[PDB]
Structure 1
Amino acid sequence: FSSKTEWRVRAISAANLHLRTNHIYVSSDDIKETGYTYILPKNVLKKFICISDLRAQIAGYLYGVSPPDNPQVKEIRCIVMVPQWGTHQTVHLPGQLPQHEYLKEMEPLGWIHTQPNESPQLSPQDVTTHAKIMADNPSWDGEKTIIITCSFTPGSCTLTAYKLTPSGYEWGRQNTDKGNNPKGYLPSHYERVQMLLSDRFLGFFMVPAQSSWNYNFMGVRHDPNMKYELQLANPKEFYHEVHRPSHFLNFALLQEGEVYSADREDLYA
């Protein structure tokens, strides 16, 4: 990245993300009609869209449950943001899975991540990351977890849900190439699962305790094996002050200053 004025322009662009949050499109096509259905609360959806960036992808774990006497539908009741740094085509989450008391009552349902532009297929990077997470963590059942992709289309956010088939799981768990077009990736590895919005219930967020979630500016400080404790709160903004300490802290002090400054009495105080 340029990192000199590109971040300035991107911050200015991200300041208008809340306009996208009223033009949302759901891709209801190629859905197999046989799997689960998923319900995403609009409050957490809008907060996630607002706190994101137009270029560097962000991602967060989903937790949810099933409504009483309706186990084939799953309500997403929580989103967890973890110390991460991402590029325009991938997100480098830490190996540790979220662990907290409140989450113990909900069953993990996958993860949701942003996309700079819409694409008609699940990317090799996303499939391999999903497979790696599932293999590393036994709690991630391959039939209930999914991937939710939010693509920033012109003046809108298009949401699409994808599920990983066993063949894709094996290919991802074995693959090691992080390039855009690895070998052995086929459209049979994933399938579309039905996802819809809901105004009837509200979900919540969970952010790290000691630090914030966005490390993009503090890239060096992040490690995949980093450990973190959670906390019940709401996320900050991508370009929040805490997330870019360099811009605010790299200044200098005052030495012999205010010596030739103007004289103006603050009469009111």
Structure 2
Amino acid sequence: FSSKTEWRVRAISAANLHLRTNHIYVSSDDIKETGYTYILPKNVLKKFICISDLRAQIAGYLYGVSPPDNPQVKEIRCIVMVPQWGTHQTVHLPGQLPQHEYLKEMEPLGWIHTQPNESPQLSPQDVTTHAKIMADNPSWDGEKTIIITCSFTPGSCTLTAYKLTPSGYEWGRQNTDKGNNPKGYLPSHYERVQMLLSDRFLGFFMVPAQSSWNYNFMGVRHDPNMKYELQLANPKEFYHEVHRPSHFLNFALLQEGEVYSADREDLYA
């Protein structure tokens, strides 16, 4: 509904997100070994956790290259934030993929998103989202691009990395129903993949050109077909003043209130 109370509770909550930042876990599970392995620089991870909110999913797009002479590892060197808004179970971000100059040097590795409740599976909403990106984008390679799910555990953050299997990709291309239990969904659709955090190199951010990224507070101003440019600069926090204009634009006041207490005492500067 209106969730007026919700906006504030979550707002003073999120001011502590940086506490999570220093306790994180990473899924270690069976390594395919024929697969790629993705390294996520820790700095972007920290900042990405810090801008988020504990209910609305936010998402970011992964861009990186493989180190010289080492084709089987993908360093993620960049995260791009685009105009978007979340639900608690999913994220709506526009049809256009990032286009920009700093990006030309690297390849897209997929996307990363916050996940209010921890689940040991790739949410149907995700496999469906990813397949549907992939359908419309040849730029995204099935085998090279992943979905990193970053979940908020108590006092902590914990993350896993998924790849679609071809079974999954086909299901997802097909899938309409976005409910939590669509028909024909299977654990056969996704696969876990190997990912490591790193302090060895720094990742950087790309961010919308004329606005910021977070449209949650304006849902009517967001459209699938909306176009955007980019810039080199960091994301503002979720509850940052700019993301919520409607609330700072709440002033209904007559100036003459100032008539009262017209004793002006200053005597400074």
**TM-score of the aligned structures, taking structure 2 as reference length:** 0.98
After alignment, is 243-252 or 110-119 more displaced?
243-252
Q: Aligned-pair distance for 1:32?
A: 2.1
* Contact persistence 1:31–1:191 (CA under 8 A): no
* Equivalent residue, structure 2, for 1:241: 241
Q: Deviations over 1:57-83 (max 9, x none)?
A: 000100000001101001000000000
Tell whether 2:193 aligns with 1:189: no
Of 43-52 and 250-259, the range deviating more from structure 2:
250-259
Query: In structure 2, how many angstroms separate the alpha carbons of the residues matched to 1:57 and 1:140?
Result: 22
CA distance in 2, matches of 1:8, 1:135: 39
Secondary structure of 1:70's aligned partner: coil
Percent identical across equivalent pairs?
100
3-state SS of the aligned residue for 1:236?
Answer: coil
The CA deviation string for residues 2-57 of structure 1, in whole angstroms up to 9 with x for no partner, is 42111100001100000000100001013323200100000000000000000000
- Counterparts of 1:246 and 1:3 in 2: how far apart (Å)? 15
Q: List aligned pairs for 1:99-248, cutoff 5 A.
A: 99-248=99-248
Count of aligned pairs between the two proteins: 269
CA distance, structure 2, for counterparts of residue 258 and residue 2 of structure 1? 33
CA distance in 2, matches of 1:225, 1:169: 23
* Post-superposition offset of 1:264: 4.1
CA deviations 1:79-117 (Å, max 9, x no partner) are 000000110001001000100011111000000000001
C-alpha displacement of 1:212: 0.7
C-alpha separation between the residues in 1 aligned to 2:89 and 2:78?
Answer: 25
List gaps (5 residues or longer) in structure 2: none
Deviation at 1:148, TM superposition (A): 0.2
| Structure-1 separation of matches of 2:149 and 2:247 | 31
RMSD of aligned residue pairs (Cα, Å): 1.0
> What are the within-5 Å matches in structure 2 for residues 50-65 of structure 1?
50-65=50-65
Given that residues 52 and 237 in structure 1 are in contact (C-alpha distance below 8 angstroms), is that contact kept between their aligned partners in structure 2? yes
- The C-alpha deviation readout for 1:129-160, integer Å capped at 9, x for no partner, is 00000000111000000000000011110010
Offset, 1:256: 1.9
Greater displacement, 243-252 / 88-97: 243-252
Q: Where in structure 1 are there 5+ consecutive unaligned residues?
A: none
**Superposition TM-score, scaled by structure 1 size:** 0.98
> Cα offset for 1:263?
1.5
State the shift of 1:251 in Å.
1.1
Q: How far is the alpha carbon of 1:210 from its aligned partner?
A: 0.6
Report the 3-state secondary structure (helix = DSSP H, G, I; strand = E; otherwise coil) of the residue aligned with 2:267: coil
Given that 1:41 and 1:76 are in contact with CA atoms closer than 8 Å, whether structure 2 keeps it comes out as: yes
Larger CA deviation: 167-176 vs 250-259: 250-259
Deviation, structure 1 residue 257: 2.7
The CA distance in 1 between the partners of 2:162 and 2:247, in whole Å, is 38
Q: For 1:176-204, what per-residue CA distance to the aligned partner results, in whole angstroms no more than 9, with x for missing partners?
A: 11111001111111111100011110010
Report the alpha carbon displacement of residue 260 of structure 1 after superposing the two structures with TM. 1.5
Q: Secondary structure at the match of 2:21?
A: helix
